Amino acid sequence: IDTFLSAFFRLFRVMRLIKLLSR
Amino acid sequence: MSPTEAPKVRVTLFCILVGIVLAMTAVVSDHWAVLSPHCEAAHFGLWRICTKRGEKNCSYFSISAAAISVFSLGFLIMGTICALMAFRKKRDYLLRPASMFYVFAGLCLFVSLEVMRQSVKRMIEYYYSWSFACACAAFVLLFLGGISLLLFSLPRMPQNPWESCMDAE
Numbered sequence A: 001i002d003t004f005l006s007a008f009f010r011l012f013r014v015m016r017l018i019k020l021l022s023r
Numbered sequence B: 001m002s003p004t005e006a007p008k009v010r011v012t013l014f015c016i017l018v019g020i021v022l023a024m025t026a027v028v029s030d031h032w033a034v035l036s037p038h039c040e041a042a043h044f045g046l047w048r049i050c051t052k053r054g055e056k057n058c059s060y061f062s063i064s065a066a067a068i069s070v071f072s073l074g075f076l077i078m079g080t081i082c083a084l085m086a087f088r089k090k091r092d093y094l095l096r097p098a099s100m101f102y103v104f105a106g107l108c109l110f111v112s113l114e115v116m117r118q119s120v121k122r123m124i125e126y127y128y129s130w131s132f133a134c135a136c137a138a139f140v141l142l143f144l145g146g147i148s149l150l151l152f153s154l155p156r157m158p159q160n161p162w163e164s165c166m167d168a169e
Helices: B007-026 B064-090 B095-122 B132-153
Strands: none
Touching (some): B007 B064
16 A cells, blocks of 8 residues: 555564464 | 453453544544644644634545554454454354454554654644544553453463363363
8 A cells, every 4th residue: 555655564474483483 | 251251351341442432533533733833733634634723624635544544443343343252152262363453453553643643743843732642542552452352362371281272271
């Protein structure tokens, strides 16, 4: 929506490898 | 059932209710951004903007703020739906997605107020009196309530060698 026409939401995809510990 | 009727979750549900109602009311109340040119203090809002000294009228002019606001309110609606469905027919697990939705609605509201703070900074010095403290309080209420509801919904950290998650209640 920025491109159609706010910085910390990019950190959620970094936490994707916290779930790596599950194994 | 055990984490459903407990007071520790009832108080957080009440906090979420007052936060959601005050946030829904706070989207129309444009009483946070006032700028003195130097008797022409202005009023900046998401939808309609006006300046007053009789001849008073407010209308629009950055619609990303409106889009993220409607996304946040949709998140609030989904969270309320999940929370309501949790109570009946003993759906004890449905309290988690409600917490996630409330947390994300609070974060979306935080980002909207951040973009509006940037907008009011780019325009003299402003002053927050009525609605900016309201929006910040709504964000804090929703965020803390969602986090606490999530933490209470999750059973407990084992703290025992034999104890583990996903046990038989």
